């Protein structure tokens, strides 16, 4: 049978959001590209290069007009008329706006495309912005994290394929199944927070008993996500706090890449 088409364009990306797919199990990346979707453009895996791969992009945008999912990782740099990311001699913002015209659905995978992320932090050398800022007339689905668990992306695509619409979204256009709750409102160390049982430094007695990481700078009280429940890598028990380090807030604009690791969060 025919498979649903996907076009993937990277802007100011580190490739970590593509690499999340190589950890996925349901589906694995091989079952994603042979069974679930037709990946029509993705520069990390493509056999074709150069003028051949730019022809196959143009052919797919025509063939599948109105039908494809467009995915972008990385921020989009507006400073100095787009020149901080140039592909085939043109600003990446022009390739993204052209591909958005014919898309059936548009997804910002990762904090960089969702809200600017690390690339837009500090002084913001390149005038980096989000995918939604570049496409003001379109509904962009945001899947933040640095990178997210890959299944936060894969189960969003599956809902579009299987049931013919996107999952339910919050007021930042994030899927509720993955981003509907604060990490601290579903964290297994909340009993320790409640009792005043805190780690004070890495390797101390409370740290070595799995106590709450609030006084090490945990950003769980101010970060929406599923890191404590879905966790990572499908082996069981693996997320930053379970390994012994505070949440940094990488999902959440104004927290990750802004606040220091050891700066304390506000508590509701």
């Amino acid at each position: 049978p025919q498979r649903p088409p996907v076009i993937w364009i990277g802007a100011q990306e580190c490739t970590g959001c593509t690499e999340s797919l190589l950890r996925a199990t349901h589906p694995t990346v091989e079952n994603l590209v042979l069974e679930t979707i037709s990946l029509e453009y993705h520069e990390v895996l493509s056999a074709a290069f150069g003028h051949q791969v730019e022809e196959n992009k143009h052919n797919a945008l025509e063939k599948y007009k109105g039908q494809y999912v467009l995915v972008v990782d990385g921020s989009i740099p507006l400073k100095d008329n787009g020149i901080y990311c140039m592909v085939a001699g043109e600003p990446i913002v022009d390739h993204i706006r052209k591909a958005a015209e014919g898309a059936a659905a548009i997804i910002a995978i990762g904090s960089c495309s969702a809200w600017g992320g690390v690339a837009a932090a500090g002084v913001n050398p390149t005038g980096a912005v989000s995918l939604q800022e570049v496409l003001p007339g379109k509904t962009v689905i945001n899947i933040p994290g640095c990178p997210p668990n890959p299944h936060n992306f894969l189960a969003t695509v599956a809902h579009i394929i299987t049931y013919g619409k996107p999952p339910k979204l919050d007021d930042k256009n994030r899927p509720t199944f993955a981003y509907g709750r604060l990490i601290h409102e579903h964290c297994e160390r909340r009993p320790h927070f409640d009792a005043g049982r805190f780690a004070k430094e890495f390797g101390d007695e409370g740290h070595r008993e799995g106590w709450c990481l609030y006084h090490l700078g945990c950003k769980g009280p101010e970060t929406y996500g599923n890191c404590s429940t879905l966790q990572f890598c499908d082996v069981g028990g693996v997320w930053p706090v379970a390994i012994g380090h505070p949440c940094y807030g990488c999902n959440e604009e104004g927290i990750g890449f802004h606040k220091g690791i050891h700066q304390l969060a506000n508590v509701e």
Binding site: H26, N152, L154, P167, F177, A178
Partner: protein, 551 residues
């Protein structure tokens, strides 16, 4: 002539003793004995009906899930509750995936060492072994390289001098007929089976909350919260994860287990002519798919005197013909009340007095159906599906017969299925057909959630006066299971389990008639009475579970 005892029987669940009189080199008479009792029916008495399933699940951890499901069905029967269809899809996926694990582990970990000589595998040529399977299997892990790695693990274990659970085995016995190459193929498949059964139990875990001993049931439905858009509940990501494990099971079942079944029959063809335990068979229908506890995917029925053409179909778990026929006796069992009892009126009063050949010799009761002895389990199940004209069952049996024909030049007729190898074949056919059950019920769940039905639970009410009787039927891996609950003044006043290994392992009955294990052994050739491998081969074909049989 002489008398032998096999105690313990190993590579079963629980505690079994088998006695045999041998005359002129053949078993002339046998006794089956369950040697451990707990009193699980008495432990659950006087409790709230909603609590029973968590207690009686612990009748058995090999057939985990089964007593849990039968118990909620029994309370739902007494109370007149219709289970939500989503709760049926979830219960069905759990039972089908559990039963896949159970049958694979029985064929490989429990039974294979009756037929396979691990020492002989050290003499095999790995290349010749791989060449034997060309045009017989498409399995991707039959290479010479795989078989050489397996042979080297056997070589290392032997060289250590610590054989442990592989020691003092039946190596070189005259009833061991496989060539060295086929012994090495079987050991490689034994190890590969452990990966497939682990995948099957990952399906069970994601819906049950763990395994062994699931924790997602309720009188009224299930505890899983269906919400595609919810964090921390049964959402689309969790359903995709379940599907990733369902899809891993088929290739091993079809290309390894199904093919090995035909190969064992090709090397042991006289085992198609012995081990008949009964002439009557019973199975119940299974996998309900409607909103009113019916519309089963697999059929049930009753066969009398081995006549498939005149069988009686069973299409409902409320069938009064099935309900009214079932009784149990304790004449030759260690309980006080001996006359046949309908389970709603059953007692379980212990009366141990030691072993007597003509008196009491087991903790297992003796069940009958309108006064007759009956075999349950995969041979019953397969023969009822063939009587019903079920084309899926016909076709799967035909695939096993076609491999046997290619290997031997001989065919297999239905008369040859009433035997130790026919029983083994019925189990394999069931495991194969269950893979379609899993695909069907996963698709049904996804489609129903998409129509906007997220319902999973109907909260029960239990009147504080009145007497209510309920029965929960289930087609378990070992055969028809029933749990019988009486409710009086809001609490359990009687609880009786009649379990498939009770039917097959129970001792002589109120009329001194012989049950299936004891009948199956008459005529068994025994080359060495000190090492009675031939007896253990026939008994293992029934998949004994003595925690189940006695409870």
């Amino acid at each position: 002539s002489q008398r032998i005892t096999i105690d313990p029987v190993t590579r079963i669940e629980g505690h079994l003793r088998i006695d045999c009189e041998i005359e002129n080199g053949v078993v002339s008479k046998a006794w089956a004995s369950g040697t451990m009792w707990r009193g699980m029916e008495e432990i659950v008495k006087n409790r709230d009906p909603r609590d029973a399933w968590m207690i009686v699940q612990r009748i058995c951890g090999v057939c985990t899930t089964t007593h849990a499901l039968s118990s909620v069905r029994a309370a739902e029967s007494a109370l007149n509750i219709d289970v939500p269809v989503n709760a049926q899809y979830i219960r069905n996926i759990i039972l089908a995936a559990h039963t896949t694990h159970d049958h694979i582990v029985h064929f490989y970990q429990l039974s294979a060492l009756d037929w396979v000589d691990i020492t002989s595998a050290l003499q095999a040529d790995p290349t010749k072994a791989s060449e034997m399977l060309k045009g017989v299997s498409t399995w991707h892990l039959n290479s010479p390289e795989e078989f050489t790695k397996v042979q080297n693990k056997i070589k290392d274990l032997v060289a250590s001098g610590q054989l442990g659970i592989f020691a003092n085995g039946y190596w070189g016995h005259p009833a061991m007929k496989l060539p060295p190459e086929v012994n090495l193929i079987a050991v490689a498949h034994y190890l590969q089976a452990l990966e497939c059964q682990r995948d099957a139990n990952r399906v069970v875990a994601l819906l049950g909350g763990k395994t062994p001993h699931i924790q997602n049931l309720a009188v009224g439905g299930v505890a899983n919260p269906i919400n595609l858009d919810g964090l921390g509940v049964l959402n689309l990501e969790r359903l995709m994860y379940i599907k990733s494990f369902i899809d891993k099971l088929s290739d091993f079942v079809e290309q390894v287990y199904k093919v090995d079944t035909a190969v064992i029959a090709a090397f042991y063809p006289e085992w198609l002519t012995r081990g008949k335990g009964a002439v009557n068979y019973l199975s119940v229908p299974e996998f309900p798919t409607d909103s009113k506890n019916g519309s089963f995917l697999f059929p049930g029925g009753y066969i009398e005197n081995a006549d498939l053409s005149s069988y009686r179909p069973i299409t409902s778990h409320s069938d009064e013909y099935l309900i009214k026929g079932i009784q149990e006796s304790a004449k030759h069992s260690w309980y006080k009340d001996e006359a046949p009892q309908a389970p709603w009126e059953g007692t379980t009063i212990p009366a141990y007095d030691g072993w007597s050949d003509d008196g009491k010799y087991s903790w297992v009761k003796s069940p009958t159906f309108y006064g007759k002895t009956v075999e349950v389990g995969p041979l019953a199940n397969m023969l009822v599906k063939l009587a019903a004209g079920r084309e899926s069952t016909q076709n799967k049996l035909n695939e096993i017969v076609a491999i046997y024909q290619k290997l031997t030049g001989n065919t297999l007729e239905v008369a040859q299925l009433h035997s130790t190898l026919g029983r083994i074949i019925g189990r394999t056919v069931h495991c194969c057909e269950l893979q379609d059950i899993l695909q069907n019920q996963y698709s049904a769940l996804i489609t129903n959630i998409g129509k906007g039905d997220h319902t999973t639970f109907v909260k029960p009410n239990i009147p504080a006066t009145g007497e209510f009787k309920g029965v929960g039927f289930l087609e378990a891996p070992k055969g028809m299971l029933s749990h019988w609950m009486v409710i009086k003044d809001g609490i359990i006043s009687n609880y009786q389990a009649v379990v498939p290994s009770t039917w097959n392992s129970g001792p002589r009955n109120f009329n001194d008639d012989v049950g299936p294990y004891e009948q199956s052994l008459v005529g068994t050739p025994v080359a060495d009475p000190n090492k009675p491998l031939e007896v253990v081969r026939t008994i293992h074909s029934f998949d004994p579970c003595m925690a189940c049989a006695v409870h």
